[PDB]
Design a protein around this ligand. Structure first.
Ligand code: NAG
Ligand code: NAG
Lengths: 805, 814
């Protein structure tokens, strides 16, 4: 049982001359004292003096014990203890009345102190009238050094199941020698006289006359420090006589160490004691998500059985407001690039595919993926390399003289067959070979390209509206701003920078210590929507300046209703389809499959790494099947296929993270967020008045915030930051100590060279040959580096787990 | 001050069973042990045990003591000690003949260990033959911790002239109770037991049989630790009987700290006993003749005329060569380049405002020349060369009022300022004569903090007001006119001015803050890192000036200075003003009544300058060389008067400029304020540049006015760091769980700190409201009325310890 110790002593108040027991310390966790004003001091360890322990041993060697006493009140305990004192000739038969009357006085506490006008220690007297002691009345040292919402707090520190201990110290003049009385009850009782939070089990009584080298407050502190150690209170629970208590006291005195008066500095002399005290105390107490299975379709069933038992938890975990904030954030984060790519694809293919098709496809592939998905934190959507492939395929069909929207149907069919074949043979276990190398390179490149595109958009805005001395004002701005405008470029820059600054400031305030934790975290989790609202209001207040806004199609209509319909006839739309193209459409399908598979699986690897404390399981085969099948079915209806997005998924996962004081505690995983985001993206056509007032330049700040925030966990980025610091300030990670510095720098340089080569290939019109080089990084890590480095260096640098290396 | 102590035990040699003395520990202010190997562990402090101290006290309370014994060899000492044992019924007469042959034996040091083969604990018996101990033994603690070069350091640490002690322990079965012998030789002499050439003065001899709770190694260590302490050594060097040694032992045990075993020991709670140890140390030294080894006023009333002036001269001027020499760092150049703009911009603004206010009687050129001259002179002959003199706002308000008064009464304006200067001169001479600057002592930290906070807040407010003015001049419209003539000034709104100005200001502020934060990082080599971080403001200024210079078609307001060293209004003014009358003769009644505004100007200047000198030269900001008050006040006021003679305005020390200057010349530690660079070259160079600014028209005409607003915001935000009311205001929002560990948090309850902060904020608000009232010139009076508020009203609400802890005059000591 845990213990709660309380020390009380006989005192007299100056208001009225009446004795009473008042408390003066406590030993819940660390000792605390009671000042003169009536407020408790500061907690601290319990340091004793030499004479205190000496006299404690001396008076305990011949003390009086009452073990397994059967009483339930303080009066019975007091009477039995006085009877036991009388039995062993510790006090005289005529000293019993005064002692019993003194032990049964009222026990005050810290609260009543102010109502008394102060208290001072007192001594019992035969006539019953107190007097002032004939001994130096200097205040204690602990009072001098530690004294000159609390009840609930002390209730919280006291353990749930714990028993109380009461120590009574007092001075009486009619005695002849110090007397000790130790009592243990048969069962914990709540004594009415003396009040404590928990019920009393043990009881100390310390009385005696004035003697040299005896300070009774220090004797009480020594007894309470005895009663606060684990081993002594265990031995006090089991003991049945006094000899066992004496043996425990000898063991207690064996494992104490003295610190003499040393002239050394305080902190050094007090910190030199840690190993010695440690030694003395030691002397005192003497499955896989990816795996090859011997069954057809094994991975699919394995992932189903792993994930679907968590469906009710996935539904329920969505009741926090942080989920709503994450929804509002990712809605814009996924809508803006959707609109941009929609406009580009509409202007690229003569409006064969536009914004509405992309929006509908995004909505459907979000709803279905959120309902039937294994990891509902992914965000599916169109990408850039996919746009490049669409460009190339449209150019190819324009050159050879075939249709375009029809061939995509056969490409989707080939995709369906290939994904069925791949899922049948569980060929996703190859994800095991993708190490941290490729994940880090991919994420770094993606974030860097994101930031680059944002800055490119800004520079385009500056190029469209230059800084001139005069402008024309009979300009028609109905379709699009023709010619430069006075204040657009700078208002756009101001709004973007302001949004970025507010987002960063709120992100830092979230982790600060300025408000109550609940409201602070609630406000910090809604940082991005608050900043967006602020900047939207700021733009709404400005009247005369023009700024580009968000615009969506008018209704659920096809982009070009001249040549297209809601359903596409596979045999031929206007002219019949050749046979050789039907059979050769497999060639672009394989490349699209490689792209989709690699991107989706690498995204699932980055999001779902073992380091990010993901309790519920994540599925690979199921996500691939869903994504590719829905992409094919949407290509059937003429809508585009989509894929999992890196920045959007990483931002989604990072938004739903509750962090500890920083420590990553938990990630809120649920299916409601994705469903709501998809429903809003679908219904976006019914929210014209609200979206038509959101300027396009505000979302650039959000894009910069996402690109900067997604860059934190990357380790190549950390090693790049370490490229500048001198080796004196390098961190305490294993890859610093195990390998020399100028080898780590060579590693980082090799990886940066790989980045640069990937970038150069990305700028080359042979961009579609981007995936191959990427997978060619896998042999590089498997073969070439072990020809340069050593095995321990390579295991320590490219570690799959952070904690274990 | 330090001695040598040696502990030797009675052990057996492993090769062939025999008895001999072997040393086990040595003490030179620190304990060093040796293990079975024969090599001493690393030195450390000594930590005794409870049982050792208990048995040492018990055996010492009745142990025999021989003081001032006149013997030189170990045999005559053992003889006298055994005889004294015999006399006091300690040992039987049939025991001496054995103990003697036990004591007069070969002593072997550590060097002979390997040649011997190791040693073991041994127990003497009645016959004279060795034997094994009966009770079980255990591995020693200190030899297990520290044992698992030294002779050089040992022979180094012992002072050249010092005495040593010698402790001999060993067990004997034919004894009844433990015995202790303590002998102090009358004149220290060489002894065959110690190989070190140090002479011996004290000797402990501890004998007895085996018993529980008695470890003779630990008891010898306890005795040695008692002799190593200084108080017990001084007492033993002068004690004449056993009572004094007993008293010293009781004192040593009284001031000791024993700590019992615990369940979960931690290095954080064990550090909560630090003050206790200090108090115990103090109490130990309280009654000791020994002392522990590790444990003029700038303002003052002097009985002579002009005492303060001579005191300040004698204090400061001996440092003149160091003040000249300390300027060879590049940080001085960076501070010069920063403060040049920081002082030039408000000078130009206030000059233009005063020129348009008084119909160009006084303008920009007069202000520039006056600033230059009073800066050169103050840097050359000043006591505190970190102040920046210049025009202020309240001075502008007073100039407005005086111009209005002279307009109303029908008198001239530039002439009355001459008589005001004369009255100022006489008053400052009278004040310096009677050393009346000691009153600066009564102004506590309260008023200093309020003043600095208000100044910084007003600065930021004026900056934002300038920005809002820029926005008001060029609103955001749909169409503008382009046949606008901008020769005198841009008439009507312009398309892109307001946003380019805001962008430049924000960019400069952002870059300055980023470089200030990069200065403290650990990203580049320290030398280049600190050099780049120290030049943050000039680098940002150059970057933003170039950025604005590259943009061609957009208009932004630039810096403009007068064409030449000419007077503002050459119609009614001259370089020298005739005192009798410029156009009409001056009345007599006005000559005698011009004293009334002079007293107010004197009060303003004195208060501002002295509070500024307090803020700059507080003891907390590691200011080594002394700072003078009377001399600086005299210099400032005299140059202000002499400039009013020449028609130029009078100036005063500026708060924000001086604090920024002082903060720029500060070398900070990785934080700890390592040092501050104090020199006289920076101020003189700044003054010379401000004076020559008229010769840099092509360079200054290309610096946009909106870039300096970012610098103004940077100075106002940076100058807000050291304020303590600001810290307590930040603490107004945090919950009491995250409050820092400063004394004013722990000593007082929370809602009292909050009441204090609320009162001070109310005072701030009242100051602001009176500042906005057209009765602004009554702002200084109210300010000094804050001094009685702290002296009378607060002691009616708080208590003395609370008031001393909150309004602390020193930061570190509270
Ligand atoms: C829609 O498609 C037809 C098909 O010939 C084309 O002529 C027309 O330009 C398209 N509309 C656009 C591109 O807006
Ligand atoms: C100079 O002063 C005279 C008389 O005070 C005034 O008429 C003239 O306008 C002033 N010149 C300025 C303000 O440029």
């Amino acid at each position: 049982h845990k213990v709660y110790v309380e020390l009380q002593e006989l005192v007299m108040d100056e208001k009225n001359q009446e004795l009473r027991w008042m408390e003066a310390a406590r030993w819940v966790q660390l000792e605390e004292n009671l000042g003169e004003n009536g407020a408790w001091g500061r907690p601290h360890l319990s340091h004793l003096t030499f004479w205190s322990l000496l006299e404690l041993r001396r008076v305990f060697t011949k003390g009086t014990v009452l073990l397994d006493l059967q009483e339930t009140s303080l009066a019975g305990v007091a009477n039995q203890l006085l009877d036991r004192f009388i039995f062993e000739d510790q006090i005289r038969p005529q000293d019993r009345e005064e002692l019993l009357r003194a032990l049964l006085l009222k026990h005050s506490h810290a609260g009543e102190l102010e109502a008394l006008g102060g208290v001072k220690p007192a001594v019992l007297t035969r006539s019953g009238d107190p007097s002032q002691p004939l001994l130096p009345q200097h205040s204690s040292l602990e009072t001098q050094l530690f004294c000159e919402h609390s009840p609930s707090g002390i209730l919280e520190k006291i353990p749930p199941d714990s028993e109380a201990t009461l120590v009574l110290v007092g001075r009486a003049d009619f005695l002849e020698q110090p007397v000790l009385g130790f009592v243990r009850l048969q069962e914990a009782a709540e004594l009415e006289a003396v009040e404590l939070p928990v019920p009393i089990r043990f009881l100390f009584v310390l009385l005696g006359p004035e003697a040299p080298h005896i300070d009774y407050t220090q004797l009480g502190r020594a007894a309470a420090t005895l009663m606060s150690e684990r081993v002594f209170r265990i031995d006090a629970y089991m003991a049945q006589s006094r000899g066992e208590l004496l043996h425990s006291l000898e063991g207690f005195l064996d494992c104490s160490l003295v610190l003499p008066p040393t002239d050394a500095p305080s902190e050094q002399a007090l910190l030199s004691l840690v190993p010695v005290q440690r030694e003395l105390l030691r002397r005192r107490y003497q499955d896989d998500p990816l795996q090859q299975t011997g069954q057809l379709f094994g991975g699919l069933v394995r992932d189903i059985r792993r994930r679907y038992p968590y469906y009710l938890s996935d539904i329920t975990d969505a009741f926090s407001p942080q989920v709503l904030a994450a929804v509002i954030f990712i809605y814009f984060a996924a809508l803006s690039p959707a609109i941009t790519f929609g406009g580009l694809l509409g202007e690229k293919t003569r409006n064969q595919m536009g914004v509405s098709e992309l929006l509908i496809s995004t909505a459907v592939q979000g709803i279905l993926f959120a309902l039937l998905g294994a990891q509902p934190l992914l965000v599916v959507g169109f990408s850039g390399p996919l746009l490049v492939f669409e460009e190339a395929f449209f150019s190819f069909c324009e050159t050879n003289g075939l249709e375009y929207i029809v061939g995509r149907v056969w490409i989707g069919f080939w995709l369906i067959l290939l994904v069925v074949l791949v899922v049948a043979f569980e060929g996703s276990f190859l994800v095991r070979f993708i190490s941290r190398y490729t994940q880090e390179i991919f994420s770094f490149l993606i974030s860097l390209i994101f930031i680059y595109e944002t800055f490119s958009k800004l520079i385009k805005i500056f190029q469209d509206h230059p800084l001139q001395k005069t402008y024309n004002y009979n300009v028609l701005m109905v379709p699009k701003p023709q010619g430069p405008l006075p204040n657009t470029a700078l208002l756009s820059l101001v709004l973007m920078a302001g949004t970025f600054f507010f987002a960063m400031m709120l992100r830092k305030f979230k982790n600060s210590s300025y408000f109550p934790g609940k409201l602070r975290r609630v406000i910090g989790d809604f940082g991005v929507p608050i900043s967006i609202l602020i900047m939207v209001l700021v733009d709404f207040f400005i009247q005369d300046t023009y700024t580009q806004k968000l615009s969506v199609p008018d209704g659920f209509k096809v982009s070009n209703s001249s040549a297209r319909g809601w359903v596409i006839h596979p045999l031929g739309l206007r002219s019949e389809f050749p046979i050789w193209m039907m059979f050769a459409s497999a060639l672009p399908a394989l490349l699209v499959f490689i792209l989709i598979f690699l991107e989706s699986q690498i995204t699932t690897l980055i999001v779902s790494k073992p380091e990010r404390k993901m309790v519920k399981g994540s599925g690979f085969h199921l996500d691939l099947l869903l994504v590719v099948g829905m992409g094919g079915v949407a290509a059937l209806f003429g809508m585009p296929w989509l894929s999992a997005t890196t920045v959007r998924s990483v931002t989604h996962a990072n938004a739903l993270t509750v962090m500890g004081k920083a420590q990553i505690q938990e990630v809120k995983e649920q299916r409601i967020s994705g469903l709501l985001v998809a429903v809003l993206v679908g219904l976006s056509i019914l929210m014209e008045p609200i979206l038509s007032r959101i300027p396009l330049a505000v979302l650039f700040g959000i894009f910069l915030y996402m690109g900067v925030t997604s860059l934190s966990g990357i380790q190549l980025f950390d090693r790049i930051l370490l490229l500048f610091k001198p080796p004196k300030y390098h961190p305490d990670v294993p890859y610093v100590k195990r390998v020399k510095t100028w080898r780590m720098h060579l590693f980082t340089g090799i990886q940066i060279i790989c980045l640069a080569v990937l970038w150069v290939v990305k700028s080359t019109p042979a961009s579609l040959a981007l995936p191959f080089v990427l997978i060619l990084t896998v042999p590089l890590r498997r073969v070439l580096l072990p020809l340069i480095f050593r095995n321990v260096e390579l295991q320590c640098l490219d570690a799959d787990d952070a904690k274990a290396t």
